[PDB]
Design a protein around this ligand. Structure first.
Ligand SMILES: [Cu+]
Length: 129
């Protein structure tokens, strides 16, 4: 079982992966997010957020509306399965989630909810294997 992934969000508005695999034997799964570069949170903060494919657009839209001081996430958003905080350069965060929260046949997406980042393709698939 490989139950973790290290991901980077950079000063150029990209993640260094667009596909995460979760071994289904993993009871829990960990995402270790870091931010190469030197842009601070208020300019190019990133987070890592997991939802169903169908819920992504909404989480993103509501997140942008919620604003930077709420880490670009609507408080108590039930569409959000797991998430890191918003981080700037030299910062890091991790999130660990229950792998049983991922159901068969469902499509999952990860993304950064910061204003316009996901549109710029800071997103990818998350898949149970
Ligand atoms: Cu971002």
């Amino acid at each position: 079982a490989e139950c973790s992934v290290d991901i980077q969000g950079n000063d150029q508005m990209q993640f260094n992966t667009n596909a995460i695999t979760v071994d289904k034997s993993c009871k829990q799964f960990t995402v270790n997010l870091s931010h190469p570069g030197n842009l601070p949170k208020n300019v190019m903060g990133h987070n890592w957020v997991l939802s169903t494919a169908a819920d992504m657009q909404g989480v993103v839209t509501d997140g942008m509306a919620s604003g930077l001081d709420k880490d670009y996430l609507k408080p108590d958003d039930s569409r959000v399965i797991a998430h890191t905080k918003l981080i700037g350069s030299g910062e890091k965060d991790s999130v660990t989630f229950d792998v049983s929260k991922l159901k068969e046949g469902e499509q999952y997406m990860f993304f950064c909810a910061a204003a316009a980042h996901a549109a710029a393709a800071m997103k990818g698939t998350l898949t149970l294997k």
